[PDB]
Amino acid sequence: TXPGVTXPGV
């Protein structure tokens, strides 16, 4: 996720 908690995705 994010960053934080990438994306999704990448």
Add this chain to the structure above:
DNA sequence: GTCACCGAC
């Protein structure tokens, strides 16, 4: 986080 397979903590 939650998948797509990458991201970039």
